[PDB]
């Protein structure tokens, strides 16, 4: 989605300094789209990092718990 919005901004970049064209509307609009999709990406990154943390913790939890099972057995 971010690559998309930033392609739409390359698209309408032409009209960035053309205040009296159709495209120069869609340009700021793509601005909005890109900045949003970017904030979104940042949020997905935070959430993914968190999930990777939890996942690594679990991966160690297994090593430890199955060493414990080996000792108790």
């Amino acid at each position: 989605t971010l690559a998309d919005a930033i392609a739409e901004i390359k698209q309408f970049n032409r009209f960035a300094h053309d205040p009296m064209a159709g495209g120069h509307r869609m340009w700021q609009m793509a601005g909005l789209k890109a900045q949003r999709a970017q904030t979104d990406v940042n949020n997905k990154q935070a959430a993914f990092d968190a999930a990777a943390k939890e996942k690594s913790d679990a991966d160690a939890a297994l090593s430890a718990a199955q060493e414990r099972r080996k000792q108790k057995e």
Binding site: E8, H17, A21, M26, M29
Partner: protein, 576 residues
């Protein structure tokens, strides 16, 4: 039309002669005789009206009355701001089906003191309800694969209740597919007493229109527009001998998809503009002396959907306009006046007012003077989009007009000059990326009209000159035509109804969109002829033919975009 009744002047019926500002009315008869297939074609030929369109029917079009911007003409549907401009904040009639039009009252001149916002160029009250009973099955085949089929009937239920219904299908090519319009209309009007009356009215239409869109590989082609609209009006009229009361409520809903057939109407790439418009009006009038005094309120609510109008989220703009109008003919004098104050949920209040005087120096020749102040509210885009600016002030327009109307040996003529000093125009700035309130424009023009009978012949000739300029840069507002000549020769002979509509549209100034930077270029001024015949086969069946743009002229209104030339329409109607 001279010396017939109009309502647009102060919302109530009055002989159009008594409206001091220059006025024109088109009738269903008048339109049928022109075999007009679009509202833009009806307006394109009224004086001071200069229309541009990106080609055939339904194509994006913009009207310039007396040289003003498209967003400076107030378009009314039965008297309420045309809902299709709502999102744009600009009238565009290429998409409004012509079949609902029954009467056009069109008064050029400031009218904010009666109708509020965005009434600078004039008022077009398109009345859709007329008092001709009976039933009419009608059909029409034309070029650009034009087809039209239309069943309509209005009938009395009692003596006080009239029910009117019509359905219509219409499709045209002219772009690769063009404009497809389907309309259904129902209305019932009751007469509670001699003076009490009420009416409900619901009508909807679907409009599928195809257009050329900027292509970029791997990016959707938003080249198809699906518009679904419905409206529901309900009113209550007391028409007494001295006091008249109008209570009117309307609710319009519209959904405007632009999409790529391949991607789909609801695909995320599609743009959806949903818009709900509510209006409540109260108008009162009391006959005082040789005249009357009127006072109303008009309120409107406009709600939008996220995305609607290229704005992130959906907005709610509310506007209430209180107004007062006086009118009194003293001796050979006539003094009309109006004041208004519109309080918009966007910009607080803003006042507006116009006043016209009509002295009849000679019996059948009089001098009308008139001044008006009119505003225009900043529109959805320039308020809430990223370019928008919520602290924008309305665009102001000072308008002065002087006119001499008179009847000379069977000719009714009007020579009038008008000035329009639009100020505080809203302009976008390159060096800041925001909508500012800077521009100005000095419009000066003359209107010379004359209609006259010569035996069986009826001539309606008129010349228009307009010099719209930027008041700051002194450069002429581009894409306007220096001067137009509109001349229609009507002469039915041996029951054959004939009509030769002529129009010379002067030199526009449009930008070229082939090379960048876009260079302004002069458009040639050309003449366009249209021929219309109508024969009555039966006292029911009437077959009419039309050759539009007889000489196949190579005119353009948007530089680059071609507009159809020679085009024919055969049609038949069965009135019983």
């Amino acid at each position: 039309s001279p010396d017939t009744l109009v309502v647009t002047a102060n919302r109530f019926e009055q002989p159009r002669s008594t409206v001091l500002a220059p006025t024109t009315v088109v009738t269903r008869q008048d339109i049928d005789r022109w075999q007009s297939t679009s509202v833009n074609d009806v307006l394109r030929r009224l004086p001071g009206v200069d229309i541009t369109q990106n080609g055939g029917s339904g194509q994006l079009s913009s009207i310039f009355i007396r040289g003003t911007n498209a967003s400076h003409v107030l378009v009314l549907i039965d008297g309420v701001r045309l809902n299709l401009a709502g999102v744009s904040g600009s009238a565009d009639l290429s998409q409004f089906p012509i079949a609902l039009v029954q009467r056009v009252e069109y008064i050029r001149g400031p009218r904010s003191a009666v109708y509020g916002s965005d009434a600078i160029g004039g008022v077009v009250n398109i009345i859709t309800t007329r008092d001709e009973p009976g039933t009419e099955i009608s059909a029409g085949w034309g070029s650009n694969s034009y087809q039209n089929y239309d069943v309509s009937t209005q009938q009395q239920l009692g003596d006080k209740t009239r029910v009117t219904l019509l359905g219509d299908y219409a499709h045209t090519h002219g772009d690769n597919d063009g404009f497809l319009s389907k309309t259904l209309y129902g209305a019932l009007e009751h007469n509670f007493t001699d003076a009490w009356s009420g009416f409900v009215r619901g009508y909807g239409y679907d409009n599928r229109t195809n257009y050329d869109a900027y292509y970029s590989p791997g990016s959707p082609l938003l080249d198809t527009r699906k518009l679904y609209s419905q409206s529901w009006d309900a009113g209550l009229r007391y028409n007494g001998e001295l006091i008249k009361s109008q209570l009117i409520t309307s609710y319009s809903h519209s959904k405007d998809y632009n999409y790529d057939p391949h991607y789909g109407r609801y695909d995320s790439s599609a743009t959806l503009d949903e818009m709900k418009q509510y209006t409540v009006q109260w108008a009162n009038n009391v006959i005082v002396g040789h005249g009357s005094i009127g006072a109303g309120v008009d309120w409107q609510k406009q709600t939008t959907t996220p995305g609607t109008g290229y704005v992130e989220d959906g907005y709610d703009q509310r506007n209430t306009g209180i107004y007062l109008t006086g009118l009194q003919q003293v001796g050979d004098f006539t003094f009309e006046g109006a004041a208004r104050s519109d309080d918009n949920s966007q910009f607080g209040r803003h006042g507006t007012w116009q006043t016209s005087a009509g002295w009849e120096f000679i019996e059948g020749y009089r001098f009308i003077a008139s001044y008006g102040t009119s505003y225009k509210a900043p529109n959805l885009g320039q308020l809430y989009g990223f370019y928008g600016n919520p602290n924008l002030d309305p665009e102001k327009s000072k308008q002065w007009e002087g006119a001499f109307e008179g009847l000379t040996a069977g000719v009714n003529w009007r020579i009038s000059g008008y000035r329009n000093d639009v100020s505080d125009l809203i302009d976008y700035d390159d060096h800041t990326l925001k909508y500012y309130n800077e521009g100005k424009a000095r419009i000066k023009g003359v209107e010379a009209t004359a209609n006259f009978d010569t035996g069986p012949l009826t001539h309606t000739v008129s010349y228009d000159y307009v010099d719209a300029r930027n008041a700051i840069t002194d450069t002429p507002l581009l894409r306007r035509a220096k001067q137009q000549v509109k001349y229609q020769l009507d002469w039915q002979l041996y029951d054959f109804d004939w009509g030769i509509t002529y129009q010379y549209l002067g030199t526009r100034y449009d930008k070229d969109y082939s090379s960048y930077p876009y260079q302004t270029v002069k458009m040639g001024g050309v003449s366009l002829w249209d021929l219309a015949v109508a024969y009555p086969v039966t006292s029911h069946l009437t077959v009419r033919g039309k050759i539009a743009n007889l000489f196949d002229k190579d005119y353009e209104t948007v530089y680059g975009y071609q507009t159809a030339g020679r085009e024919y329409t055969l049609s038949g109607s069965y009135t019983f």
